[PDB]
Amino acid sequence: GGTIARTIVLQESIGKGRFGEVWRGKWRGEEVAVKIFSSREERSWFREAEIYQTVMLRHENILGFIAADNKDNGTWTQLWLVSDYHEHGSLFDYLNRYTVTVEGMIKLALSTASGLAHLHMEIVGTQGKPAIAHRDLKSKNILVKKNGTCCIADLGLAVRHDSATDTIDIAPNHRVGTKRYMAPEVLDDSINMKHFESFKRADIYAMGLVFWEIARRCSIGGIHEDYQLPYYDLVPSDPSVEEMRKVVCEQKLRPNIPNRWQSCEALRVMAKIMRECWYANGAARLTALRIKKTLSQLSQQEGI
Ligand SMILES: COc1ccc(-c2c(-c3ccnc(NC(C)=O)c3)[nH]c3cccnc23)nc1
């Protein structure tokens, strides 16, 4: 029989995904994360398995995929996905529990941008990698590793591009991600979903929101802000597309950038990156590769 799910023992319930239940399990003596889907969720399981098996996807800042498998308990079949386990869990959880140093903030922002740049990058060759857009980037979908760096997770809603024909591998539905992090063009449905670059640009808007969440938690001289989700000051919990659209598209508001972020170079660099991810016009936003370059130049300066 099989050598994956058969030999894994579930230990602790982690929580529920969009589809699938998440667990901490033990495989060959090591801790692993397991996501379990029912038979009726096969389409969601298969699509996530497909994204994680993309040629050349592996990267230090992308969740490490182990395997897709099935497990029959004698009554029903379970569809499994197995990955590396990260004890800190999400960046959302990490930022709620802790404050970070200037060094800590740059490590989190650089690692996030490096993972997104890798996802977004097309690699030519026999073992080429297609460009991939996430479509649901948020702090709850980024995990924090023991070394204080991030890895991008929740790849189930991703879209992949074929550069030669300029085609996207699936027929994309509108507004699939988390409403709070939807880019202006997604909220007002002006996004041209036939152009792959549109999805990459919408991911950068969401990454800007995540950088704002991190920067709030950066403590200098014991001074920092409390943890908040972006737009906590303007929309209810679980906002609708309409509530977000009125704020982001009509009133044209963005998360507030505090005055204290101008007192420190690292916070001035982060604040400038945010403003340049938040442009209503996606074509004006920075690329993930440009952000990675800016933050790498900053990490080198701070001696991280
Ligand atoms: C390809 O296989 C997987 C397996 C698990 C997850 C996954 C994880 C996950 C991963 C690693 N470590 C942890 N660690 C702590 C402490 O939660 C949690 N959290 C989630 C929440 C919702 C949906 N999926 C997930 N994704 C993909």
What distance in Å separates the CA atoms of residue 274 and residue 214, rounded to the nearest whole number?
Answer: 11
Q: Where does residue 299 rank: exposed (0-12), middle (13-18), buried (19+ CB within 10 A)?
A: middle
The CB of 83 under 6 Å from ligand 1? The reply is yes
> Do 122 and 171 touch, CB atoms closer than 8 A?
no
18 is in an annotated binding site: yes
Which residue is catalytic, options 69, 136, 154, 203?
136
Helical axes 288-302 vs 265-277, angle rounded to 10°: 180
What distance in Å separates the CA atoms of residue 18 and residue 259, rounded to the nearest whole number?
Answer: 37
Experiment used for this model? X-ray
Which residue in 263, 254, 253 sits closest to 218, CA to CA? 263
Best residue among 8, 18, 21, 35 to mutate for probing ligand 1's pocket (most ligand atoms within 8 Å of CB) is 35
Best residue among 19, 22, 54 to mutate for probing ligand 1's pocket (most ligand atoms within 8 Å of CB) is 22
Resolution in A: 1.8
CA 284 to chain centre: 21
What distance in Å separates the CA atoms of residue 23 and residue 169, rounded to the nearest whole number?
Answer: 30
The CB of 144 under 6 Å from ligand 1? The reply is no
Which residue is closest in CA terms to ligand 1's atom 15? 89
Task: Retrieve residue 66's tokens.
Answer: 């182990």
> Do 25 and 13 touch, CB atoms closer than 8 A?
no
User: Ligand 1 center to residue 218 CA distance, Å?
Assistant: 25
Question: What domains are there in the chain, each with its CATH number?
Answer: 1-87 (3.30.200.20), 88-304 (1.10.510.10)
Alpha helices (H) in the chain, listed in sequence order: 42-52, 91-97, 102-120, 184-187, 196-216, 241-245, 265-277, 288-302
